[PDB]
Every structure is written in structure tokens, then in C-alpha cells.
Amino acid sequence: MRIVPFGAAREVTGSAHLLLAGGRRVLLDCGMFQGKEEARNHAPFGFDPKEVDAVLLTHAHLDHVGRLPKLFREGYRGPVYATRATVLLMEIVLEDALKVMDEPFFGPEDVEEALGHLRPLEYGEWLRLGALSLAFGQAGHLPGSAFVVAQGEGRTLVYSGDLGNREKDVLPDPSLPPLADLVLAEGTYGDRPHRPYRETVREFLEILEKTLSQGGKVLIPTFAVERAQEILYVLYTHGHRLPRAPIYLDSPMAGRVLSLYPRLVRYFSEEVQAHFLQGKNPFRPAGLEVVEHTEASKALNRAPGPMVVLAGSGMLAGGRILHHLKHGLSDPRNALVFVGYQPQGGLGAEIIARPPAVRILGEEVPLRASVHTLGGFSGHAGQDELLDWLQGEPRVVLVHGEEEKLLALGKLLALRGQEVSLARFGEGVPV
Ligand SMILES: O=c1ccn([C@@H]2O[C@H](COP(=O)(O)O)[C@@H](O)[C@H]2O)c(=O)[nH]1
Ligand SMILES: O=c1ccn([C@@H]2O[C@H](COP(=O)(O)O)[C@@H](O)[C@H]2O)c(=O)[nH]1
Ligand SMILES: O=c1ccn([C@@H]2O[C@H](COP(=O)(O)O)[C@@H](O)[C@H]2O)c(=O)[nH]1
Ligand SMILES: [Zn+2]
Ligand SMILES: [Zn+2]
């Protein structure tokens, strides 16, 4: 048994790993590259799609399923396994990616072909392929997210997929992995742990009361898939002590995801499920409003506070959020609250440097509004959690992370007596 990295080698996007064992070929994830690596979605996979026996998707995010339609576009016609939740979220993600994408590397017929071969596989359910046995484990990173357990030829491999941040409340705790001959694991935060969750919420709430009590606007850049709904959840469970104000989920996509959430109840933590049992949707805080079009979105820029605004892109790459910043950063009564990692050299970082001004949408805008970064809202396991999850595993191959972050984790794992390396693109690793 061998595992071949075909994405996320010393980088965080493009996750795709070819599992070779028993004359069978199983692709573990098929994500697109993003940001500065976007063009690479137009390049070859590195393997022959037509020879793939099956595909397992760990979660619906674009950097894990974005190239799936390219796979079908190039011949593949085998099954694609994933949890019901992922299958459902995928439709929303892929349909949107198709529409909202400068240079497309796939057409609408490919998305249809992809969606049509999706087959549900829940946690604890074993898929048989030749002498190979596969199963999903709880990853706690997204509704329906998982890590993969592959056992065959008398050996065991575990592909972590993306591990969640267990301190948070919306998703169930990641399950520990079984003891394995090899663990292919992410190390996004291989270099550090996150600020504790609870104190992150307290701080989040203090910022809201302060800003809303004075009539200002709280701008929150957010990813549409799960981060936005999580903020909504915090607003729900604490709205009782926050000043009344409209909550604008200024993201059609996030709205569609939110709508799907009631059908995914079993994929949330016990806490969330219990809320649903009492007949209530904890992702709909009072005052919630979904802004569907540009006109209402822009109008918000001119309307006075108090108000809470959630918009994308989550990394200020573009989107409606840029317009809210352009018109709201110059007011000291407002507040910009990051709840998701900001890339180095991006607009976020620039703002965090707290310079006199910033250039947004071709204009120099004064930065008077307060700024806050709440890394505790992160959706990935922090360094400490990564070490706990990896505890006792003899061999670890790291993926999904910047080289240095990955090295930082490897060093600690090595000092712990665990064999580790940083996966290299196209280079098979024996299990
Ligand atoms: O594009 C879609 C959306 C939903 N469903 C199906 O509609 C039913 C209800 O969805 P859900 O309750 O499982 O979320 C399920 O049997 C599901 O497979 C589809 O086949 N295709
Ligand atoms: O040091 C980091 C931390 C996170 N991320 C990326 O940014 C996203 C946001 O992660 P988070 O805000 O949930 O922590 C992740 O999906 C990942 O691709 C990085 O590139 N480097
Ligand atoms: O170190 C390796 C080992 C296998 N493969 C890939 O595995 C498939 C063939 O497997 P096999 O004939 O080595 O068993 C090919 O698509 C090839 O790209 C690699 O890329 N690198
Ligand atoms: Zn992810
Ligand atoms: Zn990822």
C-alpha cells in the first residue's frame, strides 16, 4: 500500500491524494488550488483520471472538491463517496464555483456529471474495494467532514483531511484516529495553538456591545460555508444581552448554506442538536436578514448603525465586504472584526498593521474604525490539538500547510520519537 500526494504539498490548497493498494486506485479528495496557485487548476493532475477506481471526499470545501468536475471532464466515471452533508453542501459549492469563476477549467456539464456519481457513505460505514476496506471518521471541521481510514494488505493508513478546532461549539469533537502504520495529516497551524475559544467569545461580545451601544457598525468578513453560520450561532445564544440591531448576512451563498442547515441537524454537536430538539433553529438569531442583491448591499454602506454585517470574501480578496470596508473604516464608531485567518500580504494584514490609511477598490481610505482579530474562531485544530490527535502514531507525513508551519510541527513530532516528513508532490509513500 502506498499513498501519492497530488496537492497540498508544502501548501494549503489543491488537496488530492491517490491511494494505491490491491491493484486499486482510490483518490482521497480532489480540491482546487486557490489564490496565487489558481492557474494550476488548468494543469494536469499528474495521474490518469480514467484509471481511478473510486473517490472519497472528506468535506465540501472548494479546496477539497473543486477539481472533481475536472476529473469527470477528463474521463473518470467511477463513484464518488461522501457523507450526505457533504453531498448536499457540494451542490451549493460547485454550482457557485461554476458561476463565480474568472477562468473556468470546467463546464456545467462536468458539474452535472460530478454530482450524478455521488453516493452517500456515513461515518462508521465500510466501503469494500477488492481487498481494501475504507471508512470515514469524525473530523469535526464541517458538517459531514471526515478523515479516512484505509485498511488492506495487512496495513492501515489514515488520511486526516481537515481536523476541526474542538474548543468550538457547533461541530462535534473530532474523533481520535485508530493506531496506523501511516498517517497523512494536515498541519495548517503546525506552528501554534489558537487563543482559547471561550475567552474569544467573551471578547467578541464586548466588542459588539461597545460598538452597537454607540450606534456603530460591526463589520465581519466571513467565509460562506460554515464560519458565517457559526457567528450567527454565537449571536443566537447570546443575543439576549446584546443591544438590539439588525444582523445582515450580506451573502447569498451563505444564505443558501444556512437554509440547508436545518436538514443537516444530525451532523452538528450534541449541544446544537439539543437546541433543534426543542423546535428551535440556533442559526437564526433575532434580527437576522439575508441580503440577496447589490442594491440593498450597497445601501447598507450609507445606512447608519447600529448593525452587524457578515460578508465575503472571507479573505478580502473581493466581494461585497470590500465595499463595507471602503465606506465604514473611516468612522471611529465602527469596528472591523476578523474571525478568519488573513493571508500574508493581503488587505487584511495591511489593515492589521494599523497604518494611517488603506487602499480599497482604487481609493485611499482612512483607518479610524477599531480592528480586532479573533483567531480563536479558527476552524482548524491548533498545534496542541494536532499533537494530541497524532499522539502514539509511529509514522506521519505532513500536508496542508506552509513549509515552516509544517516543519514546526514535524520538529515536535520528531522530538517525540515519531517518524515524520513533509510530503512532496507526486512522490509515493509506502505504508
Ligand atoms: O439537488 C438535489 C437536492 C436534494 N436531493 C434529494 O432530496 C431528498 C431530501 O434532501 P435531504 O433532506 O436529504 O437534505 C434526498 O433524498 C436527496 O437525495 C437530490 O437528489 N438532489
Ligand atoms: O497559517 C495559516 C492558517 C490558515 N490558513 C488557510 O486559511 C484558511 C482559514 O483558516 P481558519 O480561519 O479557519 O483558521 C484555511 O482554510 C487555510 O487554507 C493558511 O493558509 N495559513
Ligand atoms: O511514486 C509514485 C508512485 C505512483 N504514482 C502514480 O501512481 C499511478 C500508477 O501506479 P503504479 O503503476 O506505480 O502501481 C500513476 O498514475 C502515477 O502517477 C506516482 O505519481 N508516484
Ligand atoms: Zn477546510
Ligand atoms: Zn483544507
Curated annotation (Swiss-Prot):
Keyword annotations of the record: Cytoplasm, Endonuclease, Hydrolase, Metal-binding, Nuclease, RNA-binding, rRNA processing, Zinc
E.C. numbers: 3.1.-.-
Gene3D superfamilies with a match to the protein in the record: 3.40.50.10890, Ribonuclease Z/Hydroxyacylglutathione hydrolase-like
Free-text comment on the cofactor: Binds 2 Zn(2+) ions.
Ranges in coiled-coil conformation: none
Binding residue positions for Zn(2+) 2: D63, H64, D162, H400
Annotated GO MF terms: metal ion binding; RNA binding; RNA endonuclease activity
Family annotation (SMART domains): Beta-Casp (SM01027), Lactamase_B (SM00849)
Subunit structure: Monomer.
Protein name: Ribonuclease TTHA0252
